[PDB]
Amino acid sequence: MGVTCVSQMPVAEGKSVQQTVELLTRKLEMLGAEKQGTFCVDCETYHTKLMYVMHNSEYPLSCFALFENGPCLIADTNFDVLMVKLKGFFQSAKASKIETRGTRYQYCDFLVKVGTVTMGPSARGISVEVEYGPCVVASDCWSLLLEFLQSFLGSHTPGAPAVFGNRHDAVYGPADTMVQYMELFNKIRKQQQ
Amino acid sequence: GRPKLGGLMDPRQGVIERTGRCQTCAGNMTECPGHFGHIELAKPVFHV
Amino acid sequence: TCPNHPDAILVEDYRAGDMICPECGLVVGDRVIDVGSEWRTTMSSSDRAMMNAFKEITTMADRINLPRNIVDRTNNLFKQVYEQKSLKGRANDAIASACLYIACRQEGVPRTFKEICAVSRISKKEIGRCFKLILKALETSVDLITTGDFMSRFCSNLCLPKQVQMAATHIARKAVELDLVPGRSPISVAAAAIYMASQASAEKRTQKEIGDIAGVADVTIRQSYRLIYPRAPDLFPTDFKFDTPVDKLPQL
Amino acid sequence: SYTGYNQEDSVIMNRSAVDRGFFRSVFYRSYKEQESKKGFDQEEVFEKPTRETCQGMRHAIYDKLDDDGLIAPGVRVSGDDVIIGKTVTLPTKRDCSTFLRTSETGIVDQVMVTLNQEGYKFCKIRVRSVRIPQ
Amino acid sequence: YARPEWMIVTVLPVPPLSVRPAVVMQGSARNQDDLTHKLADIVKINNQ
Amino acid sequence: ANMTFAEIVTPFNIDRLQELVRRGNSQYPGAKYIIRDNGDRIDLRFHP
Amino acid sequence: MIYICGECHTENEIKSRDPIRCRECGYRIMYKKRTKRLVVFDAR
Amino acid sequence: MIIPVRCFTCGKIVGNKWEAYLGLLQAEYTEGDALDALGLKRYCCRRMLLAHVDLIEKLLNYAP
Amino acid sequence: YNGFTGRKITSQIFIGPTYYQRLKHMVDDKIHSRARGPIQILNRQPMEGRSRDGGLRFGEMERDCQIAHGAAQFLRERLFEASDPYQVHVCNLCGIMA
Amino acid sequence: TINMMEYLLQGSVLDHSLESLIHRLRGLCDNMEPETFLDHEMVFLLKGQQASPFVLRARRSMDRAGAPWHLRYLGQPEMGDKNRHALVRNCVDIATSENLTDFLMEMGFRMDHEFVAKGHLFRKGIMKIMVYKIFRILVPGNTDSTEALSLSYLVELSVVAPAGQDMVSDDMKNFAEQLKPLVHLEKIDPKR
Ligand SMILES: [Zn+2]
Ligand SMILES: [Zn+2]
Ligand SMILES: [Zn+2]
Ligand SMILES: [Zn+2]
Ligand SMILES: [Zn+2]
């Protein structure tokens, strides 16, 4: 678990959704960053309250089920199979699935991932996550993430996230990154326009 | 309302309903070839 | 009955006429469904009596041009009554006539007992008695007849205009609502309303004529009309073109 | 004798002319369905059934039908489509609905409901299919 | 293969269901075949 | 597309028949049924 | 469920239970109104 | 039923000439003279107007 | 002039307006196929179901044609395998099955 | 993913002879020191509109520290052929985080019955033999006090096969046969 921050960066001007990622990723490459593979984050939804199940590719076997403010269960992939078996019993929702797919760039112990939350078949928006694997402590590693973001992100740099929340010596968790992703996804689904 | 032994629609003679199997050869409608019954005539009868 | 799927609902198919498990696709049954049918795309005494009753029912129905649906309902009612056998002592003709009357009532186009008798050799009294017995045997009931039920037929047989028919229907319904004809038969009330409307419109029909079509004596029509006459302006529809003013309507 | 495709009483047609409506036609097919209350408890009624209410139904979609069990005009209808949804009460209610010809693929042109000579409700549905020369 | 006495009908074979399968009409009203009706006739007469 | 020919699966044609099965009945050319050594028939469109 | 009278061309709502008949005309031939669902035609 | 928009053979616009053709016929032009005035030179186009039957006019006599 | 090449056709074609009629016989209404389709109750033989898939009659003339061809396997297929294949268990001692 | 079918044969041993069976299993099985596991299992049922309640079995290992809770779904019996002489059920095995109890309750699954199982686990090839003494749990929540459901211990032979091919039951029947004089392991239907 390494402190992470995810924010949405608007494409701006008349730059196409893809055109902006191409440019932002080249700007990241212009940090001496080297590509270290590909990352896929695919999330499905249920209208039950509301259930969310998300799975970052960075984690090979885990599937995360988050119940809004309620607890997140980090479970094996067989969890998706249990979900499908229950499916007739379970609620399904209507094409609310949201995915962000983009390149992973490594810059000396910081992994930066810029992706386009493509809703369904049509892209709309952009998610940036900067993670620090060495920084086990969180909520005060904010100075680091902020300085690195001002280096590359510049404008639209986020003024923290609430997943850090109350000041505590509590260690950062894979659950916290998933909660950041869920808030970001709720915003793309509803930003509209 | 159910098949009865010794009746015309004897379940032994074959399958009654499509989603069913006869008790003799335990075969479905397609597999079961149908099995003959017999009637004892109290008096001998000529054959036309 | 998919072997690998305990309690699996097999979906029917029309292309091959087979039932197939939807989750694996296994074909359970080769050509078992018979899509041709599934997809629509010496006489016994009792049966002979029933056949004669059906023939009589058809004759009576055609006498007054009743629809085949009413005929079929009458046939079903007669079958039920005849098998129930509580009316075995009564004539099959009377049972058939009462069944025809009940079928008309249930279909919502009631015919008067006199109307049924006009087409049946059985008398009105016997028809009514058999009707009561049939109702008891069937443990069913028939909605109470209203004046509006007979207006269409009576006005059409009298060849009155649609406006006159509407005026008569409104007059009868309003009279029943106001309770100006308590206890009076609906047929009598309808005949009186039709007479009022006819006398207020250009097409004027005599009491004898209206009684002839409606099956009601001119004296009964006179009584009902006298009961509804004082409030004729109230009964008449607002937008009615009075050829004869309501004040100058016949007084009798 | 242009290309040999008109040989032996055959004909070569101008595709551009056909595109311009040349010898184009309508095919109207009328389906009549009557609901009959004949039988002690065997009655037929026009209505859109349900996959569970009836004794048995089909994979064909019944969403085309309306609350009265009749397909509205202007709706495209192809094979395995229900145009009239009928239910006959089982002596549940068995599905007695009617389908179209699988090859036929047209639009419901006119739907009329009336009482036949027998006084039973019945509906006539005229389906319109456009035949372009081919 | 053929004895003259066998020509006289003493035991009457009953065709299987597949030979004279029961039909369904007007819903679930099982329409028994003509063979079923005739077999009912012989059964009644034989019992009598 | 409506008419089909049953081809026996061989190492010579295993890949081609697998591709046809993957295409399925939806898009021509494809396949309609798969028959296992058990002789049972599987409907491809019902099972994708 | 709107039906158009075949004689006077009057729209009227009708349920599955009430008889099929014009509310004012009395005419017994009814035509269903065109579906609200929109169908696309290629102008070919 | 109604005058075709295009000549079936060559595709010339022919759907806007029916009313003018009828007007000329009323003005006593011979059919050939009216076609020439309308500018239909090819006999393929002339056939459109010459052999057209306007059934829509009678179809409109039935109440909608 | 040839449409494909634009070259004048050597022979001069006879061309003019003629009144043609479109007959009701369309290939759409006549095309029909049958491949492993529904069968009837008793005969277990093909019958058209929910479509025009009732199959084609392999008549006595076709049987004689295949006999003349000598294609015994194809004839057996058409009359037995394609129409209503069936297998029964029969006792060797007494020919009647059970 | 392919589904995982569990082949199960269940039998009982009275306590007096437990020592003989333990020695015997050690000899036939692979040479591994005995596991001596202790675990707490709570079954959750979902009372939805469908009459059958979904049953998910949640297991926590009290004895083994730092080991994740295991959640499993057990399908209806698929036993058909008499020759197989085994009970076949569909099974999905998923390791879950400690916050499993809360997630299930918020989802709507309801805790029903809880038991604590203590005993020895031994394995031969894929086959796993578990010998355990089920203990009833009293008081609404706790594991401090347990009473014995029976003097005897259930012995279950379980294989989590991939569902590819078969003859898995045959191997199980042969192994069961050896323990048959010491204890009759047979397929006992859950019903009554
Ligand atoms: Zn059998
Ligand atoms: Zn299956
Ligand atoms: Zn009208
Ligand atoms: Zn032209
Ligand atoms: Zn033998």
Answer whether J95's CB lies under 8 Å from J59's CB. no
Q: Answer for the pair A150, A158: CB distance below 8 angstroms, yes or no.
A: no
Within an 8 Å CB–CB cutoff, is residue C175 touching chain B?
no
Tell me which DSSP letter residue J161 carries.
Answer: E
Question: H or E element: which one contains D128?
Answer: strand D121-131
Do J76 and C6 make contact, defined as CB atoms within 8 angstroms? yes
If you measure CA to CA, which chain I residue comes closest to D105? Answer: I28
H to C contact (≥3 Cβ pairs closer than 8 Å): no
What are the structural domains, with CATH classification, of chain J? 4-178 (2.40.320.10)
Q: Which residues of C touch I50 (CB under 8 A)?
A: 14-15, 35, 39, 41
Partners of E9 in the β-ladder: B45
Written as six digits, the tokens of C9 are 């609902």
Tell me the C-alpha distance between A119 and A98, whole Å: 5
Q: Cβ contacts (< 8 Å) between I42 and chain E: which residues?
A: 18-19, 21
Sign of the four-CA dihedral J109, J89, A86, J164? positive
Residue C201: DSSP 8-state: S
Closest CA to D36 of D46, D48, D49, D23: D46
AA identity, residue J98 = E
Q: What distance in Å separates the CA atoms of residue J173 and residue J154, rounded to the nearest whole number? A: 17
Q: In chain D, what residues touch H5 (CB-CB under 8 Å)? A: 20-21
Three-state DSSP class for I17? coil
Would you tell me which residues 35-74 of chain C have a C-beta closer than 8 angstroms to some C-beta of chain I? 35-36, 39, 41
Pick D131's closest partner by Cβ from I26, I50, I52: I26
Residues after which chain D has a gap (C–N > 2.5 Å): 91
| Residue D37 to chain E, least CA–CA distance (Å) | 12
**How remote is the CA of residue A190 from the centroid of ligand 1, in Å?**
64
How far is it, in rounded angstroms, from Cα D115 to Cα D98? 19
Task: Look at the alpha carbons of J142, J146, J150, J154 in this order and tell me if their dihedral is positive or negative.
Answer: positive
Length of chain A: 193
In sequence order, the β-bridge partners of residue J58 are J42, J71
C184 is known to lie in a ligand binding site = yes
Tally Cβ neighbours within 10 Å of residue B32. 20
Subunit contact I51:D103, Cβ cutoff 8 A: yes
Chain C residues with beta carbon closer than 8 angstroms to that of J80:
3
Instruction: Quickly list DSSP for G1-44.
Output: -EEEETTT--EEE--SSS----SSS----EEEPPPSS-------
CB J182 within 8 A of CB J35: no
Encoded amino acid at C194, one letter:
I
Say if CB I93 and CB I78 are below 8 A apart. Answer: no
Question: Under 8 Å CB-to-CB from B21, ≥6 apart: which residues?
Answer: B15, B27, B28, B32
> DSSP H helical segments within C139-217, as ranges?
147-158, 162-178, 186-200, 207-214
Structure tokens at J184: 């009759």
Q: Classify strands D93-95 and A51-56 as parallel, antiparallel or unpaired.
A: unpaired
The tokens describing C151, both together, are 């207006």
Q: What is the DSSP letter of A170?
A: P
Assess whether the previous peptide bond of E13 is cis (omega < 30° from 0): no
How far apart are alpha carbons C83 and C76 in whole angstroms? 11
Interface of I with D in 48-67 (CB under 8 A): 50-52
What residues make up the domain containing G21? Answer: 1-44
Chain-chain contact of D73 with G35 (C-beta, under 8 angstroms):
yes
DSSP class of residue A179?
A: H
Fold of C44-141: Cyclin A; domain 1 (1.10.472)
The bound ligand whose nearest atom lies closest to the alpha carbon of H12 is 4
* Minimal CA separation from D25 to chain E, in Å: 39
User: Closest Cα partner for D127 from D33, D34, D48, D63?
Assistant: D33
Nearest ligand to the CA of G28 is: 3
- Give the nearest chain G residue to D77 (CA atoms): G39
Shortest CA gap D113–chain G (Å):
5
* CA A125/CA A12 separation, integer angstroms: 10
State how far Cα A157 lies from the chain centre.
15
Q: How were these coordinates obtained?
A: cryo-EM
Helix extents (H) in chain H: 18-26, 31-38, 43-50, 55-59
Chains G and F touch (3+ CB pairs under 8 A): no
Task: Give me the number of domains chain H comprises.
Answer: 1
Please report, to the nearest 10 degrees, the dihedral formed by the alpha carbons of residues C124, C125, C128, C133 taken in order: -140
- Does residue F29 have a cis bond before it (omega within 30 degrees)? yes
Interface of I with C in 43-72 (CB under 8 A): 44, 47-51, 53
- Ranges for all domains in chain C classified under CATH 1.10.472.10: 44-141, 142-249
Residue I48 burial (10 A CB sphere; 0-12, 13-18, 19+): middle
Could you tell me which of D69, D64, D70, D71 has the C-alpha nearest to residue D47?
A: D69
Q: What is the DSSP letter of C231?
A: G
Kindly list the protein residues that place their beta carbon closer than 5 angstroms to ligand 1, a single-atom ion: B 22, 24-25, 27, 32
Q: Cα–Cα distances in Å, from C129 out to B15, C58, C91, C135, J9?
A: 52, 22, 11, 10, 76
Residue G29, domain CATH? 2.20.28.30
Rg (CA), chain G: 14
Spacing of C-alpha H28 from chain mean position: 16
In whole angstroms, give the CA distance from residue D96 to residue C37. Answer: 11
Report how many helices (DSSP H) and strands (DSSP E) chain I contains, helices first: 3, 0
- E17: nearest CA in chain B? B14
Lookup: tokens for G33: 């109104």
CB-based contact C3 J80, cutoff 8 Å: yes
For residue C30, report the distance from its CA to the centre of ligand 1, in Å: 16
Tell me the sheet residues that pair with J116: J40, J135
Read off the DSSP letter of residue J24: H
Which residue range forms the structural domain that includes residue H8? 1-64
State the distance from the centre of ligand 4 to the C-alpha of H43, rounded, in angstroms.
7
What distance in Å separates the CA atoms of residue J176 and residue J157, rounded to the nearest whole number?
8
Alpha-carbon span C116 to C101, nearest angstrom: 7
Give the three-state DSSP class for C138: helix
Confirm or deny that H7 is annotated as ligand binding: yes
Pair G2, G30: CB distance under 8 Å: no
Q: Are residues A142 and A163 in contact, defined by beta-carbon separation less than 8 angstroms?
A: no
- Min Cα–Cα distance to chain D from E26, Å: 8
For residue G31, list its beta bridge partners: D112, G4
CB within 8 Å of C75: residues ≥ 6 apart: C54, C57
Report the DSSP pairing between strands D106-115 and D98-99.
Answer: unpaired
Nearest C-alpha neighbor of B44 from the set E40, E14, E5, E8: E8
Q: Do the Cβ atoms of J108 and J21 come closer than 8 Å? A: no
Per the listing, tokens 């038969």 go with C185
Task: Round to whole Å and give the CA distance between B39 and I23.
Answer: 61
Number of alpha carbons in the 13 Å side-chain half-sphere of residue A173: 14
Which residues, other chains included, contact C36 with Cβ-Cβ below 8 Å and sequence gap of 6+? Answer: I38, I40, I47, I48, I49
Q: Does the annotation list C121 as a binding residue?
A: no
Could you give the CA distance from residue D21 to residue D25 in angstroms, rounded to a whole number? Answer: 8
Which of C7, F11, D30 minimizes the C-alpha distance to J76?
C7
C-alpha closest to that of J155 among J139, J178, J171: J178
Contact present, J107 and A73 (Cβ < 8 Å): no
The closest alpha carbon to A1, from A175, A127, A156, A145, belongs to A175
Ligand number with the minimum distance to the CA of I92: 5
B47 is in an annotated binding site: no
The residues of D assigned a catalytic role are: 9
Any alpha helices (H) in J72-120, and if so which ranges? 100-107
Q: What's the fold here for domain C142-249?
A: Cyclin A; domain 1 (1.10.472)
- Which residue in B32, B38, B45 is closest to E14 by CB distance? B38
Buried b (16+ CB within 10 A) or exposed e, D72-104: bbbbebeebbbbbbbbbbeeebbbbbbbbbbeb
Number of domains in chain G: 1
Segments in chain J forming alpha helices (H): 18-28, 100-107, 168-179
Q: Are C10 and C20 in contact (CB under 8 A)?
A: yes
Q: What gap in Å lies between CA D128 and CA A187, rounded to an integer?
A: 48
Residue A36, helix vs strand vs coil: strand
DSSP class per residue in E1-48: ---GGGGSEEEEEE--TTTSPPEEETTTEEE--HHHHHHHHHHHHHH-
Q: How many CA atoms lie within 13 A of F3 on its CB side?
A: 5
Which of D115, D127, D132 to mutate against chain G (most G CBs within 10 Å)?
D115
CA distance B3 to A42: 57
Residues D17, H10: Cα–Cα separation, whole Å = 8
Tell me the binding residues of G.
Answer: 5, 8, 22, 24-25, 27
- Any idea what DSSP says for residue J147? E
Q: D45: nearest CA in chain G? A: G16
User: Across-strand partners of J22?
Assistant: none
Inter-chain touch I50–D103, beta carbons under 8 Å: no
CA J1 from chain centre, in angstroms, equals 23
Report how far residue J121's alpha carbon sits from residue J25's, in angstroms, rounded to the nearest whole number.
10
Residue from C51, C11, C46, C52 nearest C32 by CA? C11
Whole-number Å distance, alpha carbon C25 to ligand 2 midpoint, is 6
Residues within 8 A of B (CB atoms), E 1-40 only: 7-19, 22, 32, 36, 39-40
Give the position of tokens 């009931």. Answer: C141
Query: Among residues D51, D50, D64, D134, which one has the least CA distance to residue D99?
Result: D64
Contacts of D57 (CB under 8 A, 6+ apart): D49, D50, D51, D95
Find out whether D129 and D103 touch, Cβ atoms under 8 Å.
Answer: no
DSSP assigned state of A14: T
**CATH number, position H16:** 1.10.10.60
Which of C26, C31, C32 should be substituted to probe chain F, the one whose Cβ sees the most F Cβ atoms within 10 Å? C26
Partners of A79 on chain J (C-beta within 8 Å) are 94, 96
Q: How far is C181 from C171, CA to CA, in rounded Å?
A: 12
Gap between the Cα atoms of B13 and B25, Å rounded? 10
Confirm or reject contact between I3 and chain H (CB < 8 A).
Answer: no
Q: How far apart are CA D109 and CA C242, in angstroms?
A: 46
- J116: Cβ–Cβ under 8 A, 6 or more apart, which residues? J38, J39, J40, J41, J62, J134, J135, J137, J143, J146
Contacts of D10 (CB under 8 A, 6+ apart): none
Q: Please give the backbone phi and psi of residue C137, each rounded to the nearest 5 degrees, phi first.
A: -65, -45
User: Which tokens hold the place of B18?
Assistant: 């499509």
Residues C39, J73: Cα–Cα separation, whole Å: 41
Query: F37: helix, coil or strand?
Result: coil
DSSP structural state of residue C248? G
Both tokens of E41, joined, read: 């006739």
Q: What is the DSSP string of chain A?
A: ---EEEEE----TT--HHHHHHHHHHHHHTTT-EEEEEEEEEEEEE----EEEEEETTSSS-EEEEETTEEEEEE-THHHHHHHHHTTTS---SS--EEEEEEEEEETTEEEEEEEEEETTEE---EEEEEESS--S-SSTHHHHHHHHHHHT-TT-----TTT-S---PPP-HHHHHHHHHHHHHHHHHH--
CA distance B13 to B5: 10
How many angstroms separate the alpha carbon of residue A78 from the centre of ligand 2?
22
